[PDB]
Design a protein around this nucleic acid. Structure first.
Ligand SMILES: [Zn+2]
Lengths: 245, 98, 302, 145, 107
DNA sequence: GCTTGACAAAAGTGTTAAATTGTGCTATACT
DNA sequence: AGCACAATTTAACACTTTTGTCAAGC
């Protein structure tokens, strides 16, 4: 009764519709006017709102980007699945979130086909919304999805946040190759630009260089024989190491 | 006394890794990076950060050069930067290099 | 929490009694029959009088209305039955939705002439659908239904056996018990276990994860990568010292340059010879290579 | 390219997300349980993400390096370096719209200002707890009044 | 258990050398989806080109040529009418259609 | 240097049986 | 659970052609 005159909706589709019938320039002009004349706790709100309104208006953005209609899926090797000896699979947790999303999406897609009471389709769409929310940022809205052990699964955002994310990666330091360590003593006969170095550690650090430099002088048939000779500590190497150090 | 030229690497994170009969690899921490920067030595820092810890296509490409006696390829942009873009785009964030 | 909003929403619906669904089923079938007759009228054309069509279309609408009414009336039974399948493999709402699908199936496959309580027949479907779900969508690595049956059977058998014996049974024991060989029961046991999560901290403080301790058993050794190219080049050098033909003969035989081997006659196809004229040359060239001078440079790459 | 000047961020329109993928996934399957190989059309799929074995298709009609850049007409799996399973993305075509949470459940809720709705009133709408008016035909609602 | 437990990947790695010359020749086809899309797909030179292709878009597309071999073999999905026809005889339904009809005709 | 002849082991090729996997179904009442 | 049945994939076996082999000779 009276429906033919207006239109109503619910959920993300309703919000997308609202954003479609949204004129940004008019809202920006209206906020300009409100900040021009008004004052008190009516120009602070106006100015705040105008902040994001202008953020959307200036650049070549579009509010349509805030309502998803196609969800990307990260490459497989960024959520690996590796088989620990004994035939035991170990994987990330994003697999379960993607599986929940896809299952609920397919279930809604099938349920729409048959056609069913609105009471069910709405619950299904709400479940799908909550699944996507748990995917992008777990624990934000509601109680976080948890796996065996009643622990929260690491969502996509956890790839960037915390001291484990990509941003905080190169800052926390990382162990490197061609390195060693040892106890120190005094070298009172060394010059200011020299230092002692145990021949074993020198022969381990410089293994590739000596491996090469003992191929020119035909002390080994090929790089493989050279590597074997070096790992065996043959007498020939000690002459080359002094030339490469 | 320890040392490591090239040993085993962890599978999940490609940083070096050792055990009983494995070298292990030394840890170039943070204050060491601060000192390196205080020297202004950019190439040494990047080398300690890229072709010695994670960049799998860099470690082998430098080992081959060394063993063949060619020049060590100039450190470019690591491959650990074409993964941040994907991890972002997985959030519907369109980041473009200008 | 949405489980509460859903319970609230379902509550508002009014339950049904003995004979109400008796009438709803009649209305459903009448609407279906009128819809079917629709096509008969479409082909036979002759759109009946305004009322002759309007009344039938209203009866059809009544069909869908009654169907939705029954679905809403039984949603509560669905939830009541599905509220005791939780804690293992699936979320409460997914079970509720699978039960709703099962109830739709039941209502589609219900009969009102047999004179039975609707719930009695609906329970079968509402339980089967939930079980098939828990079987299909409960494991990261999917396992077909027939295997899940044997897995659950073996789980229950092992539970009962440990209860009676009061201790952990043995594989061969159940194999003798479950009418299968010990190898088959060990295989099913293998399939039983679920993948290990790769995130939780490793049992203590607390920053390192289970990931940084996995050493690949097939890692890409750099020395081998460098060695392969040198091996190719050394093969090329060694084969460049033989006859003009024998080099290409051996190559096409082992498929070095092109990449695909060739049969004995296939190579001679371009050399105008037959099986023997090719095989003799190939063998003699192999004997040539076996010479110490040739194998001195290659023996190490092996 | 080794020449950077900036690094710009922006929202991804729904028309881009489907312009990055190499296929749409439609089965929540990771790998077969007995043969340990990626399923078809599911996660880990080899036709939409890449080959699991260097220069090898799924069926196995092309194995060596001689076949690069070509696509097996049986399993549609392009043959190339197995390191492309670390650069290809897929997508999922949702059966109904879904709002990015970073902008609704934040502080301040970006939509709350873009649309001027109370956050506790927007949550009711986007979680199917209340209806919302999306358009009114003032013309007819005026004359037909 | 913090230790060195060795696992393994799924796949394989070959130390073969990339080469951009002397590779098998290929042939390109141009399939097209239902919503007017153009997708180019390579194929082996000596390969049986297929008739339909699950395109990058996500929906099956036909070729650029005019083969149009067969849109057939489809099987209609078991609907509610088939399930009613199973457990019911037309006559009964017909009779029912009459009775309820009267109720609406007689209000 | 090169062919013919017989000749045997290997690989297709086609067919048929086994197992494998997916789908439908079960009617006291239970909300 | 459990069963009943259909569709699909894997294996097993006969058989025929191909591919490698040796003896001989010219
Ligand atoms: Zn293939």
């Amino acid at each position: 009764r009276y429906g033919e005159y207006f239109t109503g909706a619910m959920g993300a589709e309703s919000i997308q519709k609202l954003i479609e019938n949204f004129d940004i320039d008019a809202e920006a002009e209206s906020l300009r006017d409100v900040i021009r004349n008004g004052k008190g706790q009516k120009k602070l709100r106006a100015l705040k709102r105008l902040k994001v309104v202008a953020a959307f208006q200036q650049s070549g953005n579009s509010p349509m980007g805030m309502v998803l209609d196609a969800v990307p899926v990260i490459p497989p090797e960024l959520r690996p699945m590796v088989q620990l000896d004994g035939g035991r699979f170990a994987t990330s947790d994003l697999n379960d979130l993607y599986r929940r999303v896809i299952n609920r999406n397919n279930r809604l897609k099938r349920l729409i086909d048959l056609g069913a009471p609105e009471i069910i389709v709405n619950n299904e769409k709400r479940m799908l919304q909550e699944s996507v929310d748990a995917l992008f940022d777990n624990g934000r809205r509601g109680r976080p999805v948890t796996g065996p052990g009643n622990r929260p699964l690491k969502s996509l955002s956890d790839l960037l946040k915390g001291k484990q994310g990509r941003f905080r990666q190169n800052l926390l330091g990382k162990r490197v190759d061609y390195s060693g360590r040892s106890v120190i003593v005094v070298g009172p006969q060394l010059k200011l630009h020299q230092c002692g170095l145990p021949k074993l550690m020198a022969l381990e650090l410089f293994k590739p260089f000596v491996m090469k430099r003992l191929v020119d002088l035909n002390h080994a048939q090929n790089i493989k024989s050279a590597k074997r000779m070096v790992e065996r500590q043959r007498p020939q190497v000690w002459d080359v190491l002094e030339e490469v150090i | 006394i320890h040392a490591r030229s090239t040993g085993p690497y962890s599978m999940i994170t490609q940083q070096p890794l050792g055990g009983k009969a494995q070298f292990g690899g030394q840890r170039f921490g943070e204050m060491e990076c601060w000192a390196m920067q205080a020297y202004g030595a950019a190439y040494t820092l990047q080398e300690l950060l890229t072709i010695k810890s994670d960049d799998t296509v860099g470690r082998v490409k430098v080992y081959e050069a060394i063993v063949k006696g060619e020049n060590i390829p100039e450190p470019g942009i690591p491959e650990s930067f074409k993964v941040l873009l994907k991890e972002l785009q997985s959030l519907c964030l369109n980041v473009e290099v200008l | 929490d949405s489980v509460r909003a859903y319970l609230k929403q379902i509550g508002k619906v009014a339950l049904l009694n003995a004979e109400e669904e008796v009438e709803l089923a009649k209305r459903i079938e009448a609407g279906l029959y009128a819809t079917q007759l629709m096509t008969e009228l479409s082909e036979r054309g002759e759109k009946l009088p305004a009322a002759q069509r309007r009344d039938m279309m209203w009866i059809c609408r009544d069909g869908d209305r009654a169907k939705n009414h029954l679905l809403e009336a039984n949603l509560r039974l669905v939830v009541s039955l599905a509220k005791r399948y939780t804690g293992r493999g699936m979320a409460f709402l997914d079970l509720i939705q699978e039960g709703n699908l099962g109830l739709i199936r039941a209502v589609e496959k219900f009969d009102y002439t047999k004179g039975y309580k609707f719930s009695t027949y609906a329970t079968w479907w509402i339980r089967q659908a939930i079980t098939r779900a828990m079987a299909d969508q409960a494991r990261t690595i999917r396992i077909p239904v027939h295997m899940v049956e044997v897995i659950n059977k073996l789980g229950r058998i092992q539970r009962e056996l440990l209860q009676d014996l009061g201790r952990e049974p043995t594989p061969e024991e159940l194999a003798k018990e479950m009418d299968i060989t010990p190898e088959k029961v060990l295989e099913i046991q293998q399939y039983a276990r679920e993948p290990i999560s790769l995130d939780q901290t490793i049992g203590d403080e607390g920053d390192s994860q289970l990931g940084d301790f996995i050493e690949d058993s097939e890692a890409v050794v750099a020395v081998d990568a460098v060695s392969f190219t040198l091996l190719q080049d050394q093969l090329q050098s060694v084969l460049d010292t033989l006859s003009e033909r024998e080099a290409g003969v051996v190559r096409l035989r082992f498929g070095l340059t092109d990449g695909q081997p060739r049969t004995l006659d296939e190579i001679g196809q371009v050399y105008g010879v037959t099986r023997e004229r090719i095989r003799q040359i190939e063998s003699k060239t192999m004997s040539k290579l076996r010479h110490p001078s040739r194998s001195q440079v290659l023996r190490d790459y092996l | 390219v080794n020449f950077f000047d900036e690094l710009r961020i922006g929202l991804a329109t729904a028309e881009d997300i489907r312009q990055w993928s190499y296929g749409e996934v439609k089965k929540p399957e990771t790998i077969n349980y007995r043969t340990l190989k990626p399923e078809k059309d599911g996660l880990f799929c080899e036709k939409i993400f890449g080959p699991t074995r260097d220069w090898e298709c799924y069926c196995g009609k092309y194995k060596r390096v001689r076949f690069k850049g070509i696509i097996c007409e049986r399993c549609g799996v392009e043959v190339t370096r197995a390191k492309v399973r670390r650069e290809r993305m897929g997508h999922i075509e949702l059966a109904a719209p879904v709002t990015h949470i970073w902008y609704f459940k934040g502080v301040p809720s970006r939509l709350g200002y873009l649309l001027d709705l109370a956050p506790k009133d927007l949550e009711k709408i986007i979680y199917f707890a209340a209806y919302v008016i999306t358009s009114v035909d003032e013309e007819m609602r005026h004359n037909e009044l | 258990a913090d230790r060195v437990l060795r696992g393994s990947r799924l796949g394989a790695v070959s130390y073969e050398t990339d080469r951009n010359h002397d590779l098998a020749p290929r042939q390109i086809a141009r399939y097209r989806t239902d919503n007017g899309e153009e997708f180019e797909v390579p194929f082996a030179d000596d390969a049986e080109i297929p008739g339909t292709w699950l395109c990058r878009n996500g929906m099956e597309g036909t070729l650029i040529e005019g083969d149009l071999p067969e849109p057939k073999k489809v099987k209609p999905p078991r609907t509610h009418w088939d399930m009613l026809l199973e457990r019911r005889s037309i006559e009964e339904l017909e009779e029912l259609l009459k009775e309820r009809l009267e109720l609406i005709r007689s209000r």
